[PDB]
Amino acid sequence: HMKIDILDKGFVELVDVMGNDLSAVRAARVSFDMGEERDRHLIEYLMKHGHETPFEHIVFTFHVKAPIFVARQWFRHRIASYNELSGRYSKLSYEFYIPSPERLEGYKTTIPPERVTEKISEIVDKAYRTYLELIESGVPREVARIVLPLNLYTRFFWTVNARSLMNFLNLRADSHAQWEIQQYALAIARIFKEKCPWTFEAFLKYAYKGDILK
Amino acid sequence: HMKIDILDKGFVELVDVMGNDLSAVRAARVSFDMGEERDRHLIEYLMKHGHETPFEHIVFTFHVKAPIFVARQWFRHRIASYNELSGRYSKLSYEFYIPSPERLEGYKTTIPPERVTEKISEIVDKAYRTYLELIESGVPREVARIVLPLNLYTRFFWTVNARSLMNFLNLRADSHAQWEIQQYALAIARIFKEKCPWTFEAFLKYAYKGDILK
Amino acid sequence: HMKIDILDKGFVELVDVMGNDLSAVRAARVSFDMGEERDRHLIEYLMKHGHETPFEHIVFTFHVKAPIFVARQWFRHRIASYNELSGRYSKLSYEFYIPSPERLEGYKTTIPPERVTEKISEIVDKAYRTYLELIESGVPREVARIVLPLNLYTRFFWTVNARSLMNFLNLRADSHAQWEIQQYALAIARIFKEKCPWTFEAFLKYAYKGDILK
Amino acid sequence: HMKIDILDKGFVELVDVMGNDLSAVRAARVSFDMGEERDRHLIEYLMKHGHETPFEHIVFTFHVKAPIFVARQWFRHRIASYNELSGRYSKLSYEFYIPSPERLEGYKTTIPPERVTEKISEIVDKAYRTYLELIESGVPREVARIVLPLNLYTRFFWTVNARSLMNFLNLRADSHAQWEIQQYALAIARIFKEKCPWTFEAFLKYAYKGDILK
Numbered sequence: 001h002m003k004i005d006i007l008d009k010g011f012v013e014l015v016d017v018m019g020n021d022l023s024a025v026r027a028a029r030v031s032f033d034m035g036e037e038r039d040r041h042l043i044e045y046l047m048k049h050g051h052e053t054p055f056e057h058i059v060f061t062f063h064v065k066a067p068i069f070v071a072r073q074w075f076r077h078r079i080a081s082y083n084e085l086s087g088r089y090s091k092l093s094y095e096f097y098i099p100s101p102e103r104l105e106g107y108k109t110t111i112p113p114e115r116v117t118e119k120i121s122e123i124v125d126k127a128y129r130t131y132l133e134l135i136e137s138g139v140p141r142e143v144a145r146i147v148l149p150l151n152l153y154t155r156f157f158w159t160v161n162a163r164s165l166m167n168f169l170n171l172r173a174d175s176h177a178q179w180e181i182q183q184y185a186l187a188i189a190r191i192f193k194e195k196c197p198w199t200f201e202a203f204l205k206y207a208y209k210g211d212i213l214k
Numbered sequence: 215h216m217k218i219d220i221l222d223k224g225f226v227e228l229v230d231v232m233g234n235d236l237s238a239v240r241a242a243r244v245s246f247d248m249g250e251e252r253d254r255h256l257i258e259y260l261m262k263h264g265h266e267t268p269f270e271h272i273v274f275t276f277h278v279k280a281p282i283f284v285a286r287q288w289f290r291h292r293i294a295s296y297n298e299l300s301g302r303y304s305k306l307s308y309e310f311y312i313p314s315p316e317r318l319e320g321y322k323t324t325i326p327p328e329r330v331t332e333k334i335s336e337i338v339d340k341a342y343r344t345y346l347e348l349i350e351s352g353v354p355r356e357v358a359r360i361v362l363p364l365n366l367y368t369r370f371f372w373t374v375n376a377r378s379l380m381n382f383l384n385l386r387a388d389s390h391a392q393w394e395i396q397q398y399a400l401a402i403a404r405i406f407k408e409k410c411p412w413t414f415e416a417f418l419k420y421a422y423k424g425d426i427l428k
Numbered sequence: 429h430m431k432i433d434i435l436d437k438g439f440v441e442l443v444d445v446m447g448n449d450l451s452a453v454r455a456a457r458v459s460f461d462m463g464e465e466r467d468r469h470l471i472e473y474l475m476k477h478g479h480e481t482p483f484e485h486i487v488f489t490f491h492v493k494a495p496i497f498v499a500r501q502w503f504r505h506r507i508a509s510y511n512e513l514s515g516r517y518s519k520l521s522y523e524f525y526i527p528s529p530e531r532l533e534g535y536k537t538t539i540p541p542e543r544v545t546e547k548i549s550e551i552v553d554k555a556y557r558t559y560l561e562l563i564e565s566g567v568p569r570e571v572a573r574i575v576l577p578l579n580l581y582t583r584f585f586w587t588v589n590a591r592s593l594m595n596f597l598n599l600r601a602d603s604h605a606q607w608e609i610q611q612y613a614l615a616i617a618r619i620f621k622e623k624c625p626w627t628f629e630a631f632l633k634y635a636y637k638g639d640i641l642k
Numbered sequence: 643h644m645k646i647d648i649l650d651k652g653f654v655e656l657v658d659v660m661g662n663d664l665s666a667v668r669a670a671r672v673s674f675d676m677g678e679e680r681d682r683h684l685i686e687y688l689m690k691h692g693h694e695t696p697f698e699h700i701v702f703t704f705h706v707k708a709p710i711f712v713a714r715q716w717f718r719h720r721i722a723s724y725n726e727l728s729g730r731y732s733k734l735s736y737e738f739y740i741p742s743p744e745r746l747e748g749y750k751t752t753i754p755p756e757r758v759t760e761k762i763s764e765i766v767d768k769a770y771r772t773y774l775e776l777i778e779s780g781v782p783r784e785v786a787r788i789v790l791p792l793n794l795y796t797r798f799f800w801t802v803n804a805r806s807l808m809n810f811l812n813l814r815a816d817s818h819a820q821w822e823i824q825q826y827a828l829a830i831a832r833i834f835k836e837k838c839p840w841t842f843e844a845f846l847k848y849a850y851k852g853d854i855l856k
């Protein structure tokens with residue numbers, strides 16, 4: 001399975017996939033034939049004209065490890081399926097996204113970037129210590145967790161078809177999206193390209209609305 | 215690929231599937247483990263309590279040949295993907311659903327059922343003859359086809375996840391649904407049972423709302 | 429209520445609407461203020477950049493009378509709500525779309541267009557006569573109706589938000605769509621313009637993908 | 643507009659509504675009549691048999707102020723529309739949900755509940771102080787906010803139809819849901835009952851799956 005490390009402790013991994021470029025061609029044609037130049041031209045035609053329903057017949061499942069603030073943005077994509085770790089039902093692990101000092105490149109700051117990174121580490125350590133103190137005193141998990149910060153890592157399974165994935169890439173593989181989710185979208189794109197090369201190349205050429213891919 | 219004949223000239227065929235019973239278990243648990251009693255109990259637990267999002271991670275693609283009046287009902291299931299043969303873009307084939315005389319069992323009629331079957335065959339033959347006359351006189355396809363009856367066969371690809379498929383089975387594998395679409399739903403159920411035995415058995419035991427399966 | 433005649437016997441009527449241009453502005457801003465240049469500029473900004481979720485907070489309900497082949501295309505728009513007259517549960521009325529001879533403008537035909545119109549009327553009359561014969565002999569409605577042609581009129585209620593309506597207009601108020609549904613989309617557009625002038629004008633300027641509106 | 647205070651600093655307010663009980667009746671019947679015992683019986687019939695599409699023609703818009711951990715759960719309801727305050731684009735206000743000591747009723751704790759409440763207040767104060775320090779040193783908002791806890795208040799507009807609202811009530815007006823979101827769902831229910839009394843009463847009698855309403 002293709003797995004790609006993201007941020008300091010995150011990842012994207014492909015769990016499963018149904019279909020390939022030919023799945024869209026066969027759905028478009030409503031083919032009996034389960035047997036090229038013509039198939040690739042059909043994908044380009046569909047993409048250039050906005051005929052994207054055939055790409056709904058290609059489906060992916062990913063396992064993603066990401067901070068909560070990234071997952072909040074990601075879960076706004078309603079045309080998909082999600083199942084996520086629960087802070088009601090589980091004790092949550094001490095794992096936080098701590099930005100690199102390079103995260104602040106281009107910003108002039110009155111605290112050195114290495115000190116910003118330190119201050120973030122210090123406050124999330126204090127928050128986790130309070131979380132644990134509450135848990136260990138008998139406070140229910142679902143209440144104790146409310147002190148934890150948005151940079152806490154979470155994990156989820158995401159099942160999404162290629163049409164909705166292309167929408168995700170338009171929006172998230174783009175400079176207007178937050179840099180952290182851009183990094184995830186770059187990995188999603190790499191996996192999509194590997195699994196569906198003709199669809200992906202046609203997408204970049206004719207339909208992709210963002211400004212970071214190729 | 216599993217294929218099942220339906221009605222006089224129809225079929226349902228499985229084109230592809232992503233996942234199996236374990237896909238729902240792994241999504242529910244957000245598992246790293248890609249490795250029983252415990253997995254089957256989890257599926258039953260989910261089903262008995264209405265926790266059905268994990269079943270969205272199992273996906274099917276079918277190729278279906280059905281009369282238009284069956285397809286009209288089927289396409290009301292919005293949480294799915296469809297691509298269908300077009301009467302704008304193609305010449306449509308002379309293939310009609312002609313009910314068997316047994317279709318009228320339990321109804322007292324003042325025309326013998328064999329004569330009902332004959333009258334249906336006769337009018338659809340006349341309609342197709344008019345369609346062809348129009349086509350052959352230069353009338354555009356998209357206009358000529360408007361004379362064709364609702365028992366004309368059509369074909370489509372359908373991609374659907376197991377949660378939405380279970381909704382389809384609740385509604386269509388049921389005595390209140392039209393008998394013709396019941397027959398399709400029985401075939402969809404057979405394929406679902408073969409591919410996802412634990413999910414299907416748990417569905418019948420705990421969640422299925424209809425009155426025809428088992 | 430705004431009502432517009434379409435084709436020979438069809439219509440589109442607005443039944444209800446929630447909101448107006450300001451609904452999108454207030455949702456975008458998450459406003460407490462329930463109180464111009466600034467509001468119109470926000471709508472244009474949203475539209476020009478593809479930020480269309482705020483328009484989901486404007487909702488319409490229409491009552492539409494259209495032939496079945498138009499309704500088949502229309503009902504492919506899944507992000508909406510429909511309720512339609514049933515040929516299982518009701519006797520269907522003798523009302524058919526008969527194209528005008530002008531429908532064939534630009535096509536050279538070997539049957540005069542007035543004779544095409546006559547041949548269509550003649551076959552649908554024969555089909556309805558068979559339908560009625562079957563009904564009156566005790567054949568269940570749901571079976572008798574299968575002989576009826578795709579130009580039979582049907583009626584439905586459609587509830588749709590402005591984002592999905594704009595998608596509908598991109599696709600259906602366009603020369604590539606069948607002329608008959610174009611005529612419906614023109615009426616939908618007129619009603620949308622009346623109810624949401626700033627959104628509609630911004631849509632035409634920045635986002636509309638079709639080639640018939642203004 | 644109906645507004646209801648929730649938790650310590652939260653609220654639910656109705657912003658707009660389209661339709662009423664009669665909207666579902668008129669959609670079900672595909673009525674021309676825009677004019678009782680019969681209308682209420684139709685709603686009960688629909689509800690008792692699971693025929694819930696007609697209720698999609700009743701739509702609500704709410705403005706909700708809730709902590710992020712409540713909003714995370716709420717936003718899992720995909721069949722709806724949301725627009726939320728952004729921590730990328732805005733400075734976020736110092737407003738946190740601090741549980742009442744009574745929140746821990748039924749739990750034996752080794753820290754007195756008043757001290758739990760104090761410890762939660764203390765850590766979120768420290769987190770906000772770090773957030774502000776980062777902002778005021780020139781760290782971009784979208785990065786500074788990652789230290790803020792899940793009990794931070796957020797606000798959003800929610801547009802939802804009555805069918806999806808009933809699903810929300812089944813799931814969230816229920817003892818298995820987290821107590822905090824139960825409190826929101828109780829307020830949503832009160833507003834739904836006021837606006838759609840026949841639908842709500844039929845829902846409670848025939849369809850509601852939860853264990854807290856009436």
Ligand SMILES: Cc1cc2nc3c(=O)[nH]c(=O)nc-3n(C[C@H](O)[C@H](O)[C@H](O)COP(=O)(O)OP(=O)(O)OC[C@H]3O[C@@H](n4cnc5c(N)ncnc54)[C@H](O)[C@@H]3O)c2cc1C
Pocket residue numbers: 076077078079080164167171172176177178481484507589591592595721722723724725726727728731
């Ligand atoms: C840079 C950026 C900044 C953002 N800022 C904010 C913000 O400040 N606040 C905020 O709340 N959100 C914000 N968002 C989130 C944004 O509003 C969308 O929720 C998100 O981008 C998902 O887009 P989508 O609706 O196209 O995706 P999906 O929800 O996956 O929908 C896919 C497609 O299905 C259709 N669709 C799905 N459901 C409906 C429906 N109910 N009605 C109509 N059409 C539907 C649309 O065609 C849509 O494109 C931001 C997103 C980005 C990328």
Ligand SMILES: Cc1cc2nc3c(=O)[nH]c(=O)nc-3n(C[C@H](O)[C@H](O)[C@H](O)COP(=O)(O)OP(=O)(O)OC[C@H]3O[C@@H](n4cnc5c(N)ncnc54)[C@H](O)[C@@H]3O)c2cc1C
Pocket residue numbers: 290291292293294378381385386390391392507508509510511512513514517695698721803805806809
């Ligand atoms: C016996 C029978 C008779 C019928 N008679 C008629 C009739 O006379 N007229 C008629 O028009 N239709 C009729 N229908 C069709 C019926 O109204 C539904 O369109 C169909 O059964 C599909 O059901 P669904 O909406 O659950 O499926 P899908 O559209 O696949 O939706 C699946 C689920 O997603 C949710 N959902 C999807 N979209 C929305 C949305 N926009 N809002 C809220 N929830 C949503 C719901 O939880 C729904 O159960 C009939 C169906 C049956 C089975």
Ligand SMILES: Cc1cc2nc3c(=O)[nH]c(=O)nc-3n(C[C@H](O)[C@H](O)[C@H](O)COP(=O)(O)OP(=O)(O)OC[C@H]3O[C@@H](n4cnc5c(N)ncnc54)[C@H](O)[C@@H]3O)c2cc1C
Pocket residue numbers: 053056079161163164167293294295296297298299300303504505506507508592595599600604605606
């Ligand atoms: C000129 C023309 C010719 C056509 N020819 C054919 C044909 O030959 N055969 C045929 O079968 N169909 C045909 N169609 C129908 C077409 O494939 C679409 O079904 C229809 O245009 C509705 O578009 P939509 O999916 O954008 O709308 P909706 O279904 O309303 O969806 C709205 C938006 O929500 C999103 N969306 C909704 N559901 C999903 C999902 N499951 N996955 C991903 N994204 C989703 C997409 O962003 C979509 O744009 C044709 C349409 C047109 C206009």
Ligand SMILES: Cc1cc2nc3c(=O)[nH]c(=O)nc-3n(C[C@H](O)[C@H](O)[C@H](O)COP(=O)(O)OP(=O)(O)OC[C@H]3O[C@@H](n4cnc5c(N)ncnc54)[C@H](O)[C@@H]3O)c2cc1C
Pocket residue numbers: 079080081082083084085086089267270293375377378381718719720721722806809813814818819820
């Ligand atoms: C007590 C409780 C505990 C929970 N625990 C967890 C947890 O540990 N982890 C977790 O990730 N989530 C958890 N959830 C969230 C839960 O999985 C659902 O996301 C949430 O309840 C919304 O339900 P829904 O999908 O029915 O709603 P919506 O998303 O609004 O969907 C409404 C209806 O539309 C249909 N539907 C919509 N989209 C699809 C689709 N893509 N495929 C098929 N059908 C569709 C279904 O019929 C559905 O009922 C929990 C929820 C509750 C109430």
Ligand SMILES: O=c1ccn([C@H]2C[C@H](O)[C@@H](COP(=O)(O)O)O2)c(=O)[nH]1
Pocket residue numbers: 069072073074076176177178726727728729730731
């Ligand atoms: O780039 C963005 C900005 C916002 N949001 C959505 C996610 C949350 O529901 C809400 C606020 O997100 P933040 O701006 O706080 O990340 O809007 C996104 O999806 N992407």
Ligand SMILES: O=c1ccn([C@H]2C[C@H](O)[C@@H](COP(=O)(O)O)O2)c(=O)[nH]1
Pocket residue numbers: 283286287288290390391392512513514515516517
């Ligand atoms: O059993 C039914 C009856 C109706 N419909 C939907 C399909 C059409 O959109 C409309 C009318 O269908 P008929 O009753 O004419 O089949 O309602 C169904 O989906 N299933």
Ligand SMILES: O=c1ccn([C@H]2C[C@H](O)[C@@H](COP(=O)(O)O)O2)c(=O)[nH]1
Pocket residue numbers: 298299300301302303497500501502504604605606
């Ligand atoms: O312009 C078109 C052509 C096709 N279809 C969809 C509707 C039917 O599900 C199927 C076949 O439609 P016809 O081409 O037969 O109209 O594809 C459309 O929605 N619009």
Ligand SMILES: O=c1ccn([C@H]2C[C@H](O)[C@@H](COP(=O)(O)O)O2)c(=O)[nH]1
Pocket residue numbers: 084085086087088089711714715716718818819820
């Ligand atoms: O009662 C619950 C529990 C979980 N979730 C969803 C929301 C988040 O996406 C994820 C984790 O939620 P918490 O258990 O951490 O609240 O699962 C709910 O929607 N409701």
Ligand SMILES: [Cl-]
Pocket residue numbers: 092093094
């Ligand atoms: Cl840990």
Ligand SMILES: [Cl-]
Pocket residue numbers: 306307308
């Ligand atoms: Cl043929």
Ligand SMILES: [Cl-]
Pocket residue numbers: 520521522
């Ligand atoms: Cl009549």
Ligand SMILES: [Cl-]
Pocket residue numbers: 734735736
């Ligand atoms: Cl403040």
